[PDB]
Amino acid sequence: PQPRKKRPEDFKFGKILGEGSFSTVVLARELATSREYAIKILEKRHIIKENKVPYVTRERDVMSRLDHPFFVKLYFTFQDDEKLYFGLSYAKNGELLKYIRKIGSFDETCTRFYTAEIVSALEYLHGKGIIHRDLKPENILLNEDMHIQITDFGTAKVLSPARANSFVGTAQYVSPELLTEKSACKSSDLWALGCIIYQLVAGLPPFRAGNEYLIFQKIIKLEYDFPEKFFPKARDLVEKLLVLDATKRLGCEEMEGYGPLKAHPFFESVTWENLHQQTPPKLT
Numbered sequence: 052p053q054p055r056k057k058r059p060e061d062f063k064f065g066k067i068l069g070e071g072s073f074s075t076v077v078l079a080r081e082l083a084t085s086r087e088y089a090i091k092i093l094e095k096r097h098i099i100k101e102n103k104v105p106y107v108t109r110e111r112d113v114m115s116r117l118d119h120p121f122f123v124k125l126y127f128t129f130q131d132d133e134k135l136y137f138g139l140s141y142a143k144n145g146e147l148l149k150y151i152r153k154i155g156s157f158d159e160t161c162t163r164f165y166t167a168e169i170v171s172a173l174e175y176l177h178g179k180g181i182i183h184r185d186l187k188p189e190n191i192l193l194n195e196d197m198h199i200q201i202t203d204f205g206t207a208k209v210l211s212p213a214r215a216n217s218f219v220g221t222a223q224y225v226s227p228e229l230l231t232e233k234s235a236c237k238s239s240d241l242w243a244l245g246c247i248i249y250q251l252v253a254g255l256p257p258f259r260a261g262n263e264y265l266i267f268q269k270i271i272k273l274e275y276d277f278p279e280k281f282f283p284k285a286r287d288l289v290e291k292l293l294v295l296d297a298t299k300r301l302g303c304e305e306m307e308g309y310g311p312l313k314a315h316p317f318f319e320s321v322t323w324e325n326l327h328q329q330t331p332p333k334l335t
């Protein structure tokens with residue numbers, strides 16, 4: 052028997068944190084507690100006529116199932132005549148993208164630390180049979196303490212008894228199978244992990260071009276290069292993620308799961324069991 056449904060009147064709304072095609076995220080201070088939430092506001096008419104009800108519903112369903120420190124948390128939901136509100140954990144330090152851009156690229160220690168966190172999140176997600184489908188630095192957020200907080204679950208897939216076909220994520224993190232077989236699997240997220248590691252180190256994602264078509268041509272041909280600089284062990288790890296055959300990516304079920312992934316030499320000095328309680332290294 053939970054507390055009363057909240058209302059917009061219970062909040063003092065502040066700045067917009069971001070805008071999407073279908074939603075807006077706004078900082079709000081709850082008045083009875085003074086707690087700050089990031090409140091995701093979706094308009095019901097726009098959702099209905101853009102046929103997005105399955106996606107908003109999946110978002111709500113999935114977030115309600117997650118209970119882990121590396122995920123943006125859904126505390127509550129309510130609605131008025133026009134709008135839906137998701138009360139979300141407020142991730143103070145913003146997008147991981149912001150930091151890559153600000154410091155250029157990551158040293159080996161910060162790459163290791165954040166890649167390890169991303170790996171733990173995904174192990175947890177995949178253990179629950181959930182594929183993210185649009186993993187990337189824009190939706191890997193950072194809390195006040197600088198730990199990751201992954202978000203944006205409207206576009207997720209929930210497996211049942213490795214299938215999909217409808218949606219295609221952000222061009223650069225899109226996996227080949229989405230472009231050749233339009234089907235998604237947990238492994239699709241591991242491809243996106245390989246891109247993100249490459250990006251943490253190189254400062255830019257591996258497949259880049261002047262438009263989306265050319266990025267897709269590069270992806271299906273596995274057309275990318277490593278900078279000479281690149282941490283050797285991070286290079287070796289990324290080569291075992293950016294594999295065209297999805298049943299052959301490190302961490303996938305056919306490759307015997309997360310153990311071989313977390314054993315990779317690149318993660319040699321990581322203690323996996325308490326990552327969220329370690330003090331993150333400084334950028335930079």
Ligand SMILES: CC(C)n1cc(C(=O)c2cncc(NCCc3cccnc3)n2)c2c(N)ncnc21
Nearest residue numbers: 068069070071074076089139140141142190202203
């Ligand atoms: C950095 C800003 C923006 N931002 C987005 C947040 C989210 O939860 C969230 C929820 N759905 C999607 C998503 N990304 C995808 C892009 C986008 C941005 C804003 C609104 N629609 C979509 N992000 C968030 C948060 N919890 N705390 C602080 N800042 C936040």
